[PDB]
Amino acid sequence: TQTMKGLDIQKVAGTWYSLAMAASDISLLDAQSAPARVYVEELKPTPEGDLEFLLQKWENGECAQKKIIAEKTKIPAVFKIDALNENKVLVLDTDYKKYLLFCFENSAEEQSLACQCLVRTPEVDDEALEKFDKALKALPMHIRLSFNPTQLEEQCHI
Amino acid sequence: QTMKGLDIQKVAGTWYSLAMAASDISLLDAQSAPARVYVEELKPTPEGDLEFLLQKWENGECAQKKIIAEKTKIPAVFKIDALNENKVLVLDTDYKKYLLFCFENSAEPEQSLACQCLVRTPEVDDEALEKFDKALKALPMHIRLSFNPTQLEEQCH
Numbered sequence A: 001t002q003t004m005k006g007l008d009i010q011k012v013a014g015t016w017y018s019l020a021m022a023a024s025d026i027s028l029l030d031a032q033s034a035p036a037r038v039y040v041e042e043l044k045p046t047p048e049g050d051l052e053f054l055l056q057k058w059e060n061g062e063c064a065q066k067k068i069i070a071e072k073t074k075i076p077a078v079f080k081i082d083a084l085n086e087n088k089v090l091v092l093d094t095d096y097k098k099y100l101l102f103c104f105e106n107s108a109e110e111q112s113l114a115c116q117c118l119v120r121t122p123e124v125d126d127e128a129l130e131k132f133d134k135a136l137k138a139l140p141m142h143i144r145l146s147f148n149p150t151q152l153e154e155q156c157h158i
Numbered sequence B: 001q002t003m004k005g006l007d008i009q010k011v012a013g014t015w016y017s018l019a020m021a022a023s024d025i026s027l028l029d030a031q032s033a034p035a036r037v038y039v040e041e042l043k044p045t046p047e048g049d050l051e052f053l054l055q056k057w058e059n060g061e062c063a064q065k066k067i068i069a070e071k072t073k074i075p076a077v078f079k080i081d082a083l084n085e086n087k088v089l090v091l092d093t094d095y096k097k098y099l100l101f102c103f104e105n106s107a108e109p110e111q112s113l114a115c116q117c118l119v120r121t122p123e124v125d126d127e128a129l130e131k132f133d134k135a136l137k138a139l140p141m142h143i144r145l146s147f148n149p150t151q152l153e154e155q156c157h
């Protein structure tokens, strides 16, 4: 999976909206509480070059928040979120101003992938979705979801 | 959108649901979701109607359902109900490999679409999925699923 060249995380800081998601397995995304059904509300780069994700997810009939620190590696667009190196964040592309494309990747067994198209403003951006679909063309996706602007403004995209 | 020169005698026989898409995430986001239905068979009637033999997951088992799509004055457009709220639109087929169709509902407040890519054998057909993806580019879909060959053989499960 080819990641972005020359990523500057200092330029991705701020509030984002999960506009579209795709995954390698239907059960990762289909249910309201599916394991990879997580909404990115904020990206915070650290001075050390880590990227904090502020996530929301539906659990037990409520919206819950979680911070995930993705730690820097030798590749600037590849981050690790476990000490066992099975689970990664891959940044595929961004223009910084409008959209960011990233994947959660698990390579422990069958690779697992869950990818998102983030936008800076809670509107549909057809350019961002086109770039998302082109980025995914090489990957073995079996489910895609896309959200409307009303959903983008609500906790857990209700 | 709907194809020219449909011959319903040639769509007869065994199919498999390779891919599904819908206008609303809640139509497809569970085995229990209303549009999560697998086509087993199409049967043309002598009167030019098309019977859909369907399976749906209910409480951990496949339940079978037959819907009659009755012919209308527009080719490749079939009505399911007497009130004309529910329709089958046949978009395209080559008869021998794939069939693309959509269920449509126009009850207020919002129109619903749920489309499928059917294939003749329980194998992944990238050409069929590409034709399905091109057909969907014009429609306002918010969820899409495709099945692997294990899922294609195991019906609703």
Ligand SMILES: CNCCCN1c2ccccc2CCc2ccccc21
Binding pocket: A038, A055, A056, A057, A059, A064, A065, A066
């Ligand atoms: C018990 N189920 C685990 C999933 C919960 N999860 C949450 C919770 C709220 C928002 C996002 C996430 C995603 C990842 C994560 C990471 C660590 C603990 C819980 C969670």
Ligand SMILES: CNCCCN1c2ccccc2CCc2ccccc21
Binding pocket: A028, A035, A036, A037, A038, A087, A088, A104, A105, A106, A112, A113, A114
């Ligand atoms: C694969 N086990 C955890 C499933 C959810 N998970 C995913 C999903 C796909 C690929 C990788 C990962 C690991 C990290 C992660 C982070 C936040 C939510 C879900 C997930």
Ligand SMILES: CNCCCN1c2ccccc2CCc2ccccc21
Binding pocket: A022, A023, A133, A136, A137, A139, A140, A141, A142, A143, A144, B019, B020, B021, B129, B132, B133, B136, B144, B145, B146
């Ligand atoms: C493996 N490539 C499949 C490409 C088309 N496909 C997409 C597209 C983007 C994200 C996910 C998917 C998987 C399911 C699917 C279903 C129906 C039409 C296209 C697609």
Ligand SMILES: CNCCCN1c2ccccc2CCc2ccccc21
Binding pocket: B027, B034, B035, B037, B067, B080, B086, B087, B103, B104, B105, B112, B113, B114
């Ligand atoms: C709750 N909506 C109707 C139930 C599902 N339904 C759909 C779904 C989307 C669009 C049209 C229709 C029409 C009828 C029909 C027929 C067979 C399976 C599902 C559906």
Ligand SMILES: [Cl-]
Binding pocket: A144, A145, A146, B141, B142, B143, B144
């Ligand atoms: Cl979608």
